[PDB]
């Protein structure tokens, strides 16, 4: 994932 929170 390119970002946290996913």
């Amino acid at each position, epitope marked *: *994932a*390119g*970002x*946290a*929170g*996913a």
Partner: antibody
Amino acid sequence: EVQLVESGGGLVQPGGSLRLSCTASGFSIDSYGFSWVRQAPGKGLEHIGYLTAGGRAFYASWAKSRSTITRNTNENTVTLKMNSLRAEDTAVYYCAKLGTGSRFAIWGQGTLVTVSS
Amino acid sequence: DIQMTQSPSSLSASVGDRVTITCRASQSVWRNKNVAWYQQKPGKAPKRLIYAIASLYSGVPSRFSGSGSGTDFTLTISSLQPEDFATYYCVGHYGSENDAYYAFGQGTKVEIKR
């Protein structure tokens, strides 16, 4: 090209609330994560909160109790609301996909919010 | 709370000089990868120069370079130019699969000696 147009009132009274929005053009806000950041005059950048591409909002500790970040998928907008404002909250507010690890980064033009009676 | 500490807070350098700005994160960034460097010029919104620690975004002069690892990151301007006057900020992304945060360094003011 892609654009991220910011809007919302500039003058807000102490004890009141600010409401800022950003409207995307050329892409979809409901498919990316977007932050709200502010910068007091002459000071540094401060991260307020992040709304993931999945629609979950996470707030920096200082902002959690007064801030609400939402999005309108039909309008293709993201919105910040902060209540119980004080002079300390005067700042230029930006919406931004910060692009810390990705190639896609986009910032709104910035909007000065002045807290004064 | 997550913190990024830049140093120096300000510096004065002559044109052609080599400038180094460091940025220490209080904990590991997302995927040990999500750090970017921003440049803010007088009266302007911040402009991203670097992403993923060391990826130079297209159009940015190559005299700007990012490096580092773990929780220690560095911005380098190989040959300072007058148009490089600005405040420079590191910004990191942090969290887990169910938590996401960002933090800005306090900024480094780069002044041009002349």
